Design a protein around this ligand. Structure first.
Ligand SMILES: Nc1ncnc2c1ncn2[C@@H]1O[C@H](C[C@@H](N)CC[C@H](N)C(=O)O)[C@@H](O)[C@H]1O
Ligand SMILES: [K+]
Ligand SMILES: [K+]
Ligand SMILES: [K+]
Length: 219
């Protein structure tokens, strides 16, 4: 039958207002709430996301996991003219829906969808995509890759002192190894934010982890 993703885009195109990103977010959330797709209702995690973008005003953001473009629209609507969101999405069908979503919101010029797995694309950012360091990273992809991809970003020289990581779903279904690493490491200053999931009626959360630069090369 019809995929979730084709129906989400349909609903936006039929109900939201072109070039009004807020209306796009609200349409996605309305539809996904009515369908009882708990993990696809973004308004609770979005309050935390908006505050992070407003405080730090990043010029270059990397998103891991686009899906249908909700979080890309959410962040990009608050970015400055000339600022950039790179979003990595390994499923080309989802990349396609995200592209259509951005076009409808009028935010396509601020976002570049990179089609592939984060583990493959991250090592290409410096040379292929001319990235220096990221100002912010939003982690919202495969749970078991949050810690590995953080370590990969570190190794590839893509984080600087001040880079803000914001990780979603760190409680449900959970990213406990990622949390233990950043909270335990002197290279990250961390803050936790609670975020509710309907239907399951559970308090999930997001973690903000601000990179402080690498640990000493010596003991
Ligand atoms: N290793 C990976 N690299 C890139 N994309 C991935 C990877 N593992 C999963 N994904 C994608 O991560 C997405 C996970 C979603 N939860 C993203 C939701 C989206 N950020 C939103 O707020 O609506 C899916 O679209 C997956 O196809
Ligand atoms: K900035
Ligand atoms: K996730
Ligand atoms: K820490």
């Amino acid at each position: 039958g019809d995929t979730k993703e084709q129906r989400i885009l349909r609903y936006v195109q039929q109900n939201a207002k072109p070039g009004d990103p807020q209306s796009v977010l609200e349409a996605i959330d309305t539809y996904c709430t009515q369908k009882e797709w708990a993990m696809n209702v973004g308004d609770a995690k979005g309050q935390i996301m908006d505050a992070v973008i407003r405080e730090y005003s990043p010029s270059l953001v990397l998103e891991l996991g686009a899906y249908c473009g909700y979080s890309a629209v959410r962040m990009a609507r608050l970015l400055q003219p000339g600022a950039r969101l790179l979003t990595m999405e390994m499923n080309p069908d989802y990349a396609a829906i995200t592209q259509q979503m951005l076009n409808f919101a009028g935010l396509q010029d601020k976002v570049t969808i990179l089609n592939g797995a984060s583990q493959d694309l991250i090592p290409q950012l410096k040379k292929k995509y001319d990235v220096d360091t990221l100002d912010m990273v939003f982690l919202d992809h495969w749970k078991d890759r949050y810690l590995p991809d953080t370590l990969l970003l570190e190794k590839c020289g893509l984080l600087r002192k001040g880079t803000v990581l914001l990780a979603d779903n760190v409680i449900v279904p959970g990213t406990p190894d990622f949390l233990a690493y950043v909270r335990g490491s002197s290279s990250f200053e961390c803050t936790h934010y609670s975020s509710y999931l309907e239907y399951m009626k559970v308090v999930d959360g997001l973690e903000k982890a601000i990179y402080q630069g690498p640990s000493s090369p010596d003991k």
